[model samples]
Target: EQSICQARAAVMVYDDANKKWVPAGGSTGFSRVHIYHHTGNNTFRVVGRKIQDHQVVINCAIPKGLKYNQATQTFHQWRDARQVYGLNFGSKEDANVFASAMMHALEVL
Candidate 1:
């Protein structure tokens, strides 16, 4: 079992036809994410990398509305271009935990 220390939310993009959030890969699959804590600056960064090569895909500040939605079991945020990026969990409880981490991390930023 993956420990809580290994716990990570999957980054996803909204799919119109399927009406779902999918992993942010190739316009279909979602990107796996790891949220780092205790930056000491009271803020966090959202980054994306290729699992295949450890190359960076995206790196940016944690945007606004980075909160979990209990109704959807997903945590989402919007960018300046109106494109949305977010994380999804297997269970509502898991979603709550991860979202809480994100919300608290951003509370200072």
Candidate 2:
């Protein structure tokens, strides 16, 4: 049995220095964003790594639909990117932006 670290998650955005928002963080998995979760006092953790300044992602299970030929047309599919994984945000503002954008985009989609 695997024990999980459950806690409150908040929206955290990392500064995309490499300009790889769609394919950032080379983990060979589906790339997405989520709210950051603090696993420890000051250090952050991702997949159990004590990442010291990384952002945590709060994921949405449903993928946002893209506009096709018809207006308000979106493919119905589940976006199983990942659960609440941890990472780092450059600053508080960046994190907030990520969270807010995600919500707004999801709504529009």
Candidate 3:
């Protein structure tokens, strides 16, 4: 088992697919974000597990969407340009850590 990056304390989320920004939970709980590596297929996935599901994805399926951030921890999907899968975090470093692995993984597959 391996990990690309991990971040936590996600209190907010936004999915362009839904065109909205909301709390991680239904104003009840928060969530954590991390990248899980699947050794079987050698594929990685950004995970956001919580009681209430919503907007926010840091996925590994697409790399170009990582096209771009700072004190900015928000991410998106590919509807605008097929640019989606967004996840916001409390730490920018961790987000970049996730992005670094995400960036490097682009060449492997």
Candidate number achieving the greatest TM-score relative to the actual structure:
3
**Candidate with better lDDT, 2 vs 3:** 3
Whole-model Cα lDDT of every candidate shown, in order: 0.52, 0.30, 0.53
TM-score of 3: 0.55
lDDT of 1 by residue, 1-109 (tens): 1112222445566666787766565443234344554345544565655445554544556655554344475554444355456655545665666566566655656
Q: Give per-residue CA lDDT, model 2, range 19-59, as digits (tens).
A: 33321233322222332333343222122111333532233
Candidate order by decreasing lDDT: 3, 1, 2
Q: What ranges in model 1 sit over 4 Å off? A: 1-6, 15-22, 27-32, 37-41, 48-58, 64-71, 74-82
lDDT of 3: 0.53
Model 2 segments beyond 4 Å from truth? 1-62, 65-86
Q: After the best TM-score superposition of candidate 3, give how far the Cα of residue 88 lies from its true spot, in angstroms.
A: 1.6
User: Residue 1: error of model 1 in Å?
Assistant: 25
Q: Report the lDDT tens digits of candidate 3 across residue range 1-109.
A: 4766666545444555688766544453545666667778777666665535644533335344444343355442222244333455546675667566666665565
